[PDB]
Ligand binder design. Structure first.
Ligand SMILES: *[C@@H]1O[C@H](CO)[C@@H](O[C@@H]2O[C@H](CO)[C@@H](O[C@@H]3O[C@H](CO[C@H]4O[C@H](CO[C@H]5O[C@H](CO)[C@@H](O)[C@H](O)[C@@H]5O[C@H]5O[C@H](CO)[C@@H](O)[C@H](O)[C@@H]5O)[C@@H](O)[C@H](O[C@H]5O[C@H](CO)[C@@H](O)[C@H](O)[C@@H]5O[C@H]5O[C@H](CO)[C@@H](O)[C@H](O)[C@@H]5O)[C@@H]4O)[C@@H](O)[C@H](O[C@H]4O[C@H](CO)[C@@H](O)[C@H](O)[C@@H]4O)[C@@H]3O)[C@H](O)[C@H]2NC(C)=O)[C@H](O)[C@H]1NC(C)=O
Ligand SMILES: C[C@H](CCC(=O)N[C@@H]1CCN(C(=O)OCc2cc(Cl)cc(Cl)c2)C1)[C@H]1CC[C@H]2[C@@H]3[C@@H](O)C[C@@H]4C[C@H](O)CC[C@]4(C)[C@H]3CC[C@]12C
Ligand SMILES: CCCCCCCC/C=C/CCCCCCCC(=O)OC[C@@H](O)COP(=O)(O)O
Ligand SMILES: [Ca+2]
Ligand code: NA
Ligand code: NA
Ligand SMILES: [Zn+2]
Ligand SMILES: [Zn+2]
Length: 774
């Protein structure tokens, strides 16, 4: 417990018992007694003035304007501008940085991450009027229209996703507040508990760097260190000798979130907070220019989430729905999480709670879900810290337990107001380049590539952001197919089938982008037909995928009356590896549907192919209403609008809600007295030509995709308008359950788009794309 002299913001760890002088010492109440005195000098502010140029060095000043300051590494960021007639970085023209211009001794371009809390993507519209430095970074660098945060759209899940490339369910920081039933402890911004490493999973970038010999401190700063001091400390660290200097740095600003919450996102009061951020950015760049590192360093300007208009009057109370609200604990606000108030309560029943919250009031501004029924695109279920009951709250509303600020965030990560920013500037990024919106889970890989690091396993798709960089150290390669398909001929007689059923240029046309590869061990059959092709699993007794193409002027027919209950045995597949219709009769709850729609057959003769037992899938009657509407009405609609479409459809089994393809052992439900497994979800991937004037089967250029993962539910309680015509609700339900192709690949162990005219990086970008319907 001595002194900090010569050790301010030192990069080593010290003690215990010895006192600390590092940038987190205040957070551990461990700074040496003279830390405030030596290390947090504030005298005379942060800006040089003409008066002070060539002053005699006074050790009391926050920063210096003396002739030695540049030797000493501690000039104010504007010193050269005020005293040498240099220009502020923002006043110089954009000049493309073809190669890193670094001082001798630098082995890689440093990375600086400048994260802003609550920075809404639409704030970039306010432009160089308010934020000339940010606008310049955006303009001369690489930028997206916006970047998608993860759900929940709160700070800590997003900050730690940025650093790990992991979903909150994987990294463990699933909210700003959490309860962990195994630890029997709670995590909050206020508390000792957040300091235990046990909450923090994955491998953040600082650890990835350090384990691979790249110097990198933890990204957190003690909040009591002012913004200007942090910037000066980063600058001083960048002046260190080669053997002590870090290659990655982080700055966090709590603005403009703090003002967003008070005044709302569209308040006139937001201008000054944004001017203040921009001034801090200006300090960093001016400082970098002072050190001749301004064409050496890569800078990421990134937000964690946006901000919405939310007032106290738009609050739903659970007391208006639940007779007994004091038996529950609620994590409230822009999402809901419900659990039992006490584990001692044995009458506590989740099903009664869900029923009592489901579709009661006409305007109802939240929706309850068991977490395994949340849209799969959220990836918000596979963690014991996420409560079984979840409430999705409508944008602009809160939920609270009982009745006894005007901006908020935390909503569904596809909501517009939740979108945030991304700008990359420096030698490794492209120059003056706009890139499409992408998800913040993808940045960890990029940051690894900017630092020559091997990423730890994460949820980014490595290579899908290659188009952001001038130089790509990572070239992705298609995974090798693991199981090769069988091609069964006509073997069996119809008399060999005891299934209890009764009835009264394929590849080039129907697999436009090639055959999906199966990336796990299994046994499956390719089945060709006039209107569609399929990969039929002999283990699961149904298609893994079914693929077909519908031209712009293809025609919809009905299932004629006499084939209504038609299921025909498939002579290419053995009785032993087929479904049977007897199981469906014996299952009172379960009906069946088809993957290729009989509705879209090319002829009445081809229509018979649709009724094969090998095109059949278990479907709840409730779900058939959704599925029939998609197949009969929507598929044709999309083919019209997009000038034909290619459709790949299939089952998903995810009983343990981990976003990954279930093994047989992990399947928990079968059609009554059979071993026909019941899917948890059904997917479709719908592809066409981005240029819609070119039809889907003759496309020269980029592709356009939209997909979904529909949950396979025995009721339509999710849809509060489901007692009406399907035209009133199925499509809204589908859009809620929009998905990336990549989500489907994880859920099915399939790899799509193996045969295209496009680069594989471009295909990785196609597979990460999400159609949000915003
Ligand atoms: C998003 O991307 C994720 C990352 O790839 C995917 O998540 C992974 O999923 C797999 C498959 O389900 C899962 O694998 C299981 O792992 C069990 C062991 O779990 C512990 O160890 C791992 C490994 O830690 C090291 O590697 C990870 C990356 O995975 C890295 O981030 C770590 O820092 C650590 O790094 C060190 O080692 C590596 C080399 O291994 C070095 O390269 C590196 O330099 C480091 O030195 C940890 O990930 C686990 O972490 C979980 O649990 C802890 C403790 O509770 C949590 O704090 C943490 O948040 C995390 O929790 C999440 O995952 C668990 C499941 O693991 C969930 O229950 C939970 O809700 C959270 O979501 C553990 O510390 C292993 O026993 C198990 O083995 C079984 O299957 C195999 C199959 O071969 C069989 O052989 C056996 O019979 C077993 O039955 C299985 O292998 C990974 O753990 C998991 N990783 C992460 C980070 O979550 C995710 O699926 C993907 N999502 C989607 C939708 O695609
Ligand atoms: C949870 C606290 C931090 C409290 C806080 O609200 N800090 C604010 C908001 C963001 N801040 C910040 O500087 O953010 C930088 C940042 C940027 C980006 Cl892009 C991503 C990320 Cl993730 C962060 C200023 C912190 C303080 C100390 C932390 C612990 C470490 O001292 C030791 C280890 C390090 C391991 O990697 C993780 C576990 C560990 C115990 C840390 C847990 C989190 C602690 C307690
Ligand atoms: C070598 C000495 C070993 C350590 C001695 C520890 C002394 C025992 C006291 C423990 C409680 C607090 C000490 C550790 C963390 C200090 C907490 C702190 O200073 O931050 C409070 C935090 O909520 C503020 O939340 P926000 O400001 O809202 O982020
Ligand atoms: Ca699974
Ligand atoms: Na039935
Ligand atoms: Na309903
Ligand atoms: Zn935040
Ligand atoms: Zn906030």
């Amino acid at each position: 417990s001595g002194s900090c002299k010569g050790r301010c913001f030192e990069l080593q760890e010290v003690g215990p018992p010895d006192c600390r002088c590092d940038n987190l010492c205040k957070s551990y109440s461990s700074c040496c007694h003279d830390f405030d005195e030596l290390c947090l000098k504030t005298a005379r502010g942060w800006e040089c003035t003409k008066d002070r140029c060539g002053e005699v060095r006074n050790e009391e000043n926050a920063c210096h304007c003396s002739e030695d300051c540049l030797s000493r590494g501690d000039c104010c960021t504007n010193y050269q501008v005020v005293c040498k007639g240099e220009s502020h970085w923002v006043d110089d023209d954009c000049e493309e940085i073809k190669v890193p211009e670094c001082p001798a001794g630098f082995v890689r371009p440093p990375l600086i991450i400048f994260s802003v809390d609550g920075f809404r993507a639409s704030y970039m519209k306010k432009g160089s009027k308010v934020m000339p430095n940010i606008e310049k970074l955006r303009s001369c660098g690489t930028h997206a229209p916006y970047m998608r945060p993860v759900y929940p759209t709160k700070t800590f899940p997003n900050l730690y996703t940025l650093a790990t490339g992991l979903y909150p369910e994987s990294h463990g920081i699933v909210g700003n507040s959490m309860y962990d039933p195994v630890f029997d402890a709670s995590f909050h911004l206020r508390g000792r508990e957040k300091f235990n490493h046990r909450w923090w999973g994955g491998q953040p970038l600082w650890i990835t760097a350090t384990k691979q010999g790249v110097r990198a401190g933890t990204f957190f700063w003690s909040v009591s260190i002012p913004h200007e001091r942090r910037i000066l400390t980063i600058l001083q660290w960048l002046s260190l000798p080669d053997n002590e200097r870090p290659s990655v740095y982080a700055f966090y600003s709590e603005q403009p979130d703090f003002s967003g919450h008070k005044y709302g996102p569209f308040g006139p009061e937001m201008t000054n907070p944004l001017r203040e951020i921009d001034k801090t950015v200006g300090q960093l760049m001016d400082g970098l220019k002072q050190l001749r590192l301004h064409r050496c360093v890569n800078v990421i300007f990134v937000g964690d989430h946006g901000m919405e208009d939310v007032t106290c009057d738009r609050t739903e109370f659970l007391s208006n729905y639940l007779t007994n609200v004091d038996d529950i604990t609620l994590v409230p606000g822009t999402l809901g999480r419900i659990r039992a108030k006490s584990i001692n309560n044995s009458k506590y029943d989740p099903k009664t709670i869900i029923a009592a919250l489901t579709c009661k009031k006409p305007d109802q501004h939240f929706k309850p879900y068991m977490k395994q029924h949340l849209p799969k695109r959220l990836h918000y279920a596979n963690n014991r810290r996420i409560e079984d009951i979840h409430l999705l709250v409508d944008r602009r509303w809160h939920v609270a337990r009982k009745p006894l600020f005007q901006g908020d965030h935390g909503f569904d990560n596809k909501v517009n107001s939740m979108q945030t920013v991304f700008v990359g500037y420096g030698p490794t990024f492209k120059y003056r380049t706009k890139v499409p919106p992408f998800e913040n889970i993808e940045l960890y890989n990029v940051m690894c590539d900017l630092l020559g690091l091997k990423p730890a396993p994460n949820n980014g798709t490595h290579g899908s952001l290659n188009h952001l960089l001038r130089t790509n150290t990572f070239r992705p390669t298609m995974p090798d197919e693991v199981s090769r398909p069988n091609y069964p001929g006509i073997m069996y007689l119809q008399s060999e089938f005891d299934l209890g059923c009764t009835c009264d240029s394929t590849k080039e046309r129907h697999l436009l982008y090639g055959r999906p590869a199966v990336l796990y061990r299994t046994s499956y059959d390719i089945l060709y037909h006039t209107d569609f092709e399929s990969g039929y699993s002999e283990i699961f007794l149904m298609p893994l995928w079914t693929s077909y193409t519908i031209s712009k002027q293809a025609e919809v027919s009905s299932i004629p009356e006499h084939l209504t209950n038609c299921v025909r045995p498939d002579v290419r597949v053995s009785p032993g590896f087929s479904q049977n219709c007897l199981a469906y009769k014996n299952d009172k709850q379960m009906s069946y549907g088809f993957l290729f729609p009989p509705y879209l057959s090319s002829s009445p003769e081809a229509k018979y192919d649709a009724f094969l037992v090998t095109n059949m899938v278990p479907m709840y009657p409730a779900f058939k209403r959704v599925w029939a509407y998609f197949q009969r009405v929507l598929v044709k609609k999309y083919a019209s609008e997009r000038n034909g479409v290619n459709v790949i459809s299939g089952p998903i089994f995810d009983y343990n809600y981990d976003g990954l393809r279930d093994t047989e052992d992990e399947i928990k439900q079968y059609v009554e007295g059979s071993s026909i497994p019941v899917p948890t979800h059904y997917y479709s991937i719908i592809t066409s030509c981005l240029d819609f004037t070119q039809p889907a089967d003759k496309c020269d250029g980029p592709l356009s995709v939209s997909s979904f993962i529909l949950p396979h539910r025995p009721d339509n309680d999710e849809s509060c308008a489901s007692s009406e015509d399907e035209s009133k609700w199925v499509e809204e339900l589908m859009k809620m359950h929009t998905a990336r192709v990549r989500d489907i690949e994880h859920l099915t162990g399939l790899d799509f788009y193996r045969k295209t005219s496009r680069s594989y990086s471009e295909i990785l970008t196609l597979k990460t794309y999400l159609h949000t319907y915003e």
